[PDB]
Amino acid sequence: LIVTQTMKGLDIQKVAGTWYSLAMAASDISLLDAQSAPLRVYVEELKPTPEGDLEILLQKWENGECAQKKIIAEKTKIPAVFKIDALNENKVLVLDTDYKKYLLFCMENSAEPEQSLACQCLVRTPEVDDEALEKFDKALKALPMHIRLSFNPTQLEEQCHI
Ligand SMILES: CCCCCCCC(=O)O
Numbered sequence: 488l489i490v491t492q493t494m495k496g497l498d499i500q501k502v503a504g505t506w507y508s509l510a511m512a513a514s515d516i517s518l519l520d521a522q523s524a525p526l527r528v529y530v531e532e533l534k535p536t537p538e539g540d541l542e543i544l545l546q547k548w549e550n551g552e553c554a555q556k557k558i559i560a561e562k563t564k565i566p567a568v569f570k571i572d573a574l575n576e577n578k579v580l581v582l583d584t585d586y587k588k589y590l591l592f593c594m595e596n597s598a599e600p601e602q603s604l605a606c607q608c609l610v611r612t613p614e615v616d617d618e619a620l621e622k623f624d625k626a627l628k629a630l631p632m633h634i635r636l637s638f639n640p641t642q643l644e645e646q647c648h649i
């Protein structure tokens with residue numbers, strides 16, 4: 488555990504729909520450095536299931552191509568925290584959202600020696616929301632981040648933010 492910010496009172500069904508990854512940060516440079524870096528993922532849509540799991544549609548660079556991916560994050564006993572199945576146990580946490588404009592979330596590993604982590608500022612539209620970004624930066628102050636990326640509206644309308 489590293490991130491101890493979660494949203495009190497989350498209604499997961501209300502996060503459904505279109506999002507844009509306006510900004511991303513991570514604990515290690517190599518996690519976002521290259522265009523093909525492991526956690527350089529661009530969110531397209533959040534699809535909560537009727538039973539409260541979180542399906543995530545995204546893009547990422549995998550060949551010399553922007554590939555689509557569909558990730559399933561299963562619910563836990565905590566409403567703001569979800570679990571993605573792999574060789575390793577890695578968790579999605581929702582830190583804060585107003586549903587209609589912005590959503591902040593993190594992805595974190597288990598162990599490791601000492602966890603690695605990436606967070607994003609998701610917004611509803613291809614616009615630079617400075618207030619969403621302030622709230623993202625505030626959340627990140629509590630976190631050991633060493634790379635931060637931000638996208639302009641032009642890139643936000645392109646596949647893989649080209
Ligand atoms: C919450 C989205 C999870 C990001 C990493 C998923 C692994 C991948 O798609 O390569």
Ligand SMILES: [Cl-]
Pocket residue numbers: 561562563564565566567568569
């Ligand atoms: Cl949950």
